[PDB]
Amino acid sequence: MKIEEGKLVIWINGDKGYNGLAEVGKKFEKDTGIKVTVEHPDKLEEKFPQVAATGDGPDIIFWAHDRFGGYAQSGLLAEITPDKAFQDKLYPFTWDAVRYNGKLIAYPIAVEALSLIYNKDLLPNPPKTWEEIPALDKELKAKGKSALMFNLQEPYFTWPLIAADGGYAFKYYDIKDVGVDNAGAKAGLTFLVDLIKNKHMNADTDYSIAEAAFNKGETAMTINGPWAWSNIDTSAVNYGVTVLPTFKGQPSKPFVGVLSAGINAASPNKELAKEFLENYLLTDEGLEAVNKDKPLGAVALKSYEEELAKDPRIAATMENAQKGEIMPNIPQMSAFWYAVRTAVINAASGRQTVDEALKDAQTGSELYRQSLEIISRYLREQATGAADTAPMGGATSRKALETLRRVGDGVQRNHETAFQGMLRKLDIKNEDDVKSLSRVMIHVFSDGVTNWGRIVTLISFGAFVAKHLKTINQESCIEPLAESITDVLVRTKRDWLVKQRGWDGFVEFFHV
Ligand SMILES: CCc1sc2ncnc(N[C@H](CO)C(=O)O)c2c1-c1ccccc1
Ligand SMILES: OC[C@H]1O[C@H](O[C@H]2[C@H](O)[C@@H](O)[C@@H](O)O[C@@H]2CO)[C@H](O)[C@@H](O)[C@@H]1O
Ligand code: NA
């Protein structure tokens, strides 16, 4: 296996207290003789699933809890085994954040929420509403200052505004219901794009540009998390931390993250990782080391949270958190963030209109579930000979299914001999063999030009396999088969599918 035994490699994001974490690691090495290496690679949240899937990577990965369902579903995280007495040292709602499919899949460290951070010497009374920002910027611009700069390249930072007047990710979790292009989301993003059109913000502003501007005293406000506070202390800007402005009378709703530590499932060092996490990091002295480097927010460790909760910055953090929501941890969170990131960037730049951007995001976010509904229904009715009587809950699903029935009948008829021969060559007998189908379908499906004819052929093969599985009394393998096909299709063809307008495109192409 790629990972080395008898040491710990930790990955953590570069905005967090990695030097303090390394200090904890030195203490661990002094007591145990085991060397701890902390790294902060770029795009670690994308890198981790690529390397961990091959049995490589770090022993411990730190990130907000939202990405970890995905990791867990993919087999990349060890289940953790804190005993009762350890469990009781952290807040139950922090453990709830790192529960997937009933199992604990990470240790919670700290609760993060975005707040409004403001320069008390420029703006002694910060605005309660978004709507008053344009006027305030006009006033500040007369003195060579701006009202507000924040990172527009990561949707995390814009989401509180998008969500304020009723935007939402997944309904509280009903995965069918995405609220990315409803009228509330549209309103929020239109307000953001108007700020930009009226020269109150610049589309190119990123994390670094906003942080420098605030920390040099050029802009009166930023939006950021507790990790930013250290660098402002150093700058000698006199700052406060407050509740985010309202929009159309409603609170900004930040997406709340629980910084968490997961154990790589390929690690031969799981017991050392546990010892590090429970007996060195999640203690008063351990969290203090990290916190002194870059503040964590409101920590999951009750003993130390009682001291931090007296800080008015932490109170503000908790106030904003209470108005927002805990992020979901479902495997499609990754696709939701990619889709919303693109939408914000394209709306802010003018590359798409607000309505066009958010339509594309809504299609990207729901792609996996929508594809699965269609493909699973088709596979099961082909296998059994009868359709599923439940409603879709679904206009696109229903028409796409109708289309697939019409087109797929022809394909399965014409390809029957070839499909017979391919199935005989692959010998799919049970759930273990459906696992092996993925590698073959990626190769055969991907190494080929993409068009809807080829997608129908893939799904038609699926249906033909489903009928065989039913005949051999393996009907319980049909759902996993459908999941596997949907996985190959959407992992490899996502961008083409979105550009083709998803399943509405399919329906239009074969209309005919
Ligand atoms: C794993 C079996 C699969 S998956 C798939 N996906 C798209 N096209 C296919 N075939 C068409 C026409 O055969 C193509 O390559 O354009 C296939 C075949 C498949 C099934 C039987 C024989 C050859 C390929
Ligand atoms: O922008 C989408 C992004 O948001 C969250 O990432 C936060 C992270 O939680 C914080 O710890 C801080 O580091 O800033 C990040 C924003 O750049 C999600 O946790 C993440 O999965 C998502 O891609
Ligand atoms: Na990053």
Indicate which CATH number applies to the domain containing 179: 3.40.190.10
Nearest to 90 by CA among 318, 302, 287: 302
Task: Please tell me what DSSP assigns to residue 436.
Answer: H
Mutate to test the pocket of ligand 1, among 444, 450, 455, 465 (most ligand atoms within 8 A of CB): 444
DSSP state of 331: T
Could you tell me which of 191, 132, 137, 133 has the C-alpha nearest to residue 160?
191
Q: Is the CB of 300 under 6 A from ligand 2?
A: no
> Could you tell me whether strands 103-104 and 36-39 are parallel, antiparallel, or unpaired per DSSP bridges?
unpaired
Rounded to whole angstroms, the Cα distance separating 264 from 497 reads 32
Residue nearest to atom 10 of ligand 1 (CA): 457
| Residue 11 to residue 49: CA distance in whole angstroms | 13
3-state secondary structure of 115: strand
Q: Distance, CA 375 to ligand 1 centroid (Å)? A: 16
Contact 316, 242 (CB under 8 A): yes
Closest CA to 160 of 224, 244, 220, 222: 244
**Residues 469 and 338 placed together within one structural domain of the fold:** yes
Structural contact between residues 381 and 195, judged by C-beta atoms closer than 8 angstroms: no
The CB-side HSE value for 140 (13 A sphere, CA atoms) comes to 25
Directed axis angle between helix 18-32 and helix 284-293, to 10°?
140
Give the CA count within 13 Å in the CB-facing half-sphere of 151: 15
Candidates 14, 70, 71, 8; CA nearest to 42 is 14
Q: State in Å: Cα 197 to ligand 2 middle.
A: 26
Question: CA-CA distance, 12 to 418, in Å (whole number)?
Answer: 50
Cα 339 to chain centroid, rounded? 10
Q: Which atom of ligand 2 is nearest to the CA of 207?
A: 17
**225 and 368: one domain?**
no
* Rounded Cα gap, residues 161 and 222, in angstroms: 14
Structure-block tokens of residue 457:
């052929």
Report residue 103 as tokens: 């199992």
Count the helices and strands in the chain (H runs, E runs).
22, 15
Nearest residue to 132 (alpha-carbon basis) of 220, 253, 254, 225: 220
Q: How far is the CA of 45 from the centre of ligand 2 (A)?
A: 9
Alpha helices in 216-283 (DSSP H): 229-235, 270-275
* Secondary structure letter of residue 301 according to DSSP: B
**Three-state DSSP string of 391-416:** CCCCHHHHHHHHHHHHHHHHHHHHCH
- Enter the tokens of residue 482: 């459908």
Resolution of the model in angstroms: 1.8
Region at 271 (left for phi over 0; alpha for psi -120 to 50; beta for the rest): alpha
Task: Evaluate: CB of 254 within 6 angstroms of ligand 2.
Answer: no
What is the rounded CA–CA span in Å between residue 411 and residue 457? 7
Q: Are strands 146-148 and 219-224 parallel, antiparallel or unpaired?
A: parallel
343 lies in the same domain as 251: no
Structural domain span for residue 218: 115-255
From the CA of 201, how far away is ligand 1's center (Å)?
51
Can you tell me whether residue 456 is helix, strand or coil?
helix
Co-location of 235 and 344 in the same domain: no
Enter the DSSP assignment of 282: S
* CA 210 – CA 245 distance, rounded (Å): 18
Give the type of residue at 429: K
Distance (angstroms) between ligand 3 centre and the Cα of 207 equals: 10
Judge if 198 and 341 occupy the same domain: no
Q: Is the CB of 426 under 6 A from ligand 1?
A: no
Q: Are 70 and 334 in contact (CB under 8 A)?
A: yes
Domain CATH code at residue 483 = 1.10.437.10
Residues 250 and 339 in one domain: no
250 and 344 co-located in one domain: no
Are 359 and 501 within one domain?
Answer: yes
What is the sign of the dihedral through the CA atoms of 334, 336, 341 and 346? positive
Are residues 195 and 340 both part of a single domain? no
Ligand 1 lined by 484 (C-beta under 6 Å): no
Q: C-alpha 153: how far from its chain's center?
A: 15
Contact 131, 247 (CB under 8 A): yes
| CA 112, 116, 121, 126 torsion-angle sign | negative
Regarding the beta carbon of 419 and ligand 1, being less than 6 Å apart is answered: yes
Q: Are residues 361 and 465 in the same domain?
A: yes
Q: Which of 371, 343, 393 is nearest to 180 (CA)?
A: 343
Do 341 and 481 have their domain in common? yes
Please tell me if the CB atom of residue 20 comes closer than 6 angstroms to any atom of ligand 2: no
**Using CA atoms, how far apart are residues 489 and 480, in angstroms rounded to an integer?**
14
Backbone angles phi, psi at 20, to 5 degrees: -65, -45
Q: Is 431 exposed, middle or buried (0-12, 13-18, 19+ CB in 10 A)?
A: middle
Q: Residue for token digits 């964590």?
A: 296
Residues 6+ apart with CB under 8 A from 412: 419, 460, 463, 464
Q: Are residues 245 and 360 in the same domain?
A: no
**CA gap 401, 332 in Å, rounded:** 22
Residue 78, phi then psi, degrees to nearest 5: -75, 145
